[PDB]
């Protein structure tokens, strides 16, 4: 549908802003220079809101995801496959806004982990994983049925 397609084209700006604000807030509590680089756009506000409201629960899982990603050993060659299978298994049960933010958070954690392990210049490739998965696995469609990404601005705590 046309609404699904608009949402899927907005995901890149949402994910890029989410990555920026999430990294900035964790740094203010080693930096990834690829994450430090329009802010008043509705999609930029959405990414920032979702970084803010997930902060407390994301912190509780930091140690688990660090251990699991070390075990997974993602590389340039297997990261598409691992990201897709992980994201597919996440949504097998269903979709709600928390799981959508968990997907964005997984793209953030994956991008950060591979950079810290020496895979440079990869953030754009993770962004494409997130955008393409949401289009092709009905996540953008669910978001369109909520009224688009702007509906996430009305999530609080």
């Amino acid at each position: 549908s046309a609404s699904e397609e608009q949402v899927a084209q907005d995901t890149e700006e949402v994910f890029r802003s989410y990555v920026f604000y999430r990294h900035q807030q964790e740094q203010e509590a080693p930096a990834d220079p690829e994450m430090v680089t329009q802010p008043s756009s509705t999609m930029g506000q959405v990414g920032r809101q979702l970084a803010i409201i997930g902060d407390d629960i994301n912190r509780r899982y930091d140690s688990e995801f660090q251990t699991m990603l070390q075990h997974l050993q993602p590389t340039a060659e297997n990261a598409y496959e691992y990201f897709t299978k992980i994201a597919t298994s996440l949504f097998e049960s269903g979709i709600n806004w928390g799981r959508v933010v968990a997907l964005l958070g997984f793209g953030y954690r994956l991008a950060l982990h591979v950079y810290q392990h020496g895979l440079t210049g990869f953030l754009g490739q993770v962004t494409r994983f997130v955008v393409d998965f949401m289009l092709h696995h009905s996540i953008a469609r669910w978001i369109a049925q909520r009224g688009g990404w702007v509906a996430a601005l009305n999530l609080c705590n």
């Binding site: 409201i53 629960i57 899982y61 995801f65 990603l69 709600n96 799981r99 601005l153 609080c156």
Partner: peptide, 25 residues
Amino acid sequence: EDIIRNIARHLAQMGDSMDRSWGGC
């Protein structure tokens, strides 16, 4: 395969906890 399932399970747990903690603004 075992690591993929563990990671996806944690994402679902974290996402469901986030979803339960959020209301309207």
